């Protein structure tokens, strides 16, 4: 599913990321944006034979299993196909559990290069929430 601007902040905001361990929605919305465009179903290959999944381009190394990335984690407990459904609620929990990881947002490079330090309240400019 590719999201609206709007519809993905409306989703997140239910799904409890607005001002989860202190980052606002735009931050999320924003991650999102540079990350995935709002795509459900984007796949990234990484250099370590890892691979990003979903909206957040949440990673096989740590966070779900794919079947293919050795010497690898599954801490969010889930197949990392779950991350590319149109039901975001696998990615928000996972996204809760990295952001929660002791690095804030700094986890999703794509955040800290292109989110961090910017305007991201304009990411929901308009949007009723
Ligand atoms: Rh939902
Ligand atoms: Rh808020
Ligand atoms: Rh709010
Ligand atoms: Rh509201």
Known sequence: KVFGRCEL???M???GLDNYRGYSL???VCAAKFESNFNTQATNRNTDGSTDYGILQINSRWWCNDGRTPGSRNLCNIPCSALLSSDI???VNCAKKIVSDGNGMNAWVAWRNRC???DVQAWIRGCRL
Do not use: L, P, Q, V
């Open 9 to 11: 902040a409306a989703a």
């Open 13 to 15: 905001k239910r799904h």
């Open 26 to 28: 735009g931050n999320w």
């Open 89 to 91: 609620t696998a990615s």
């Open 116 to 118: 961090k330090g910017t």
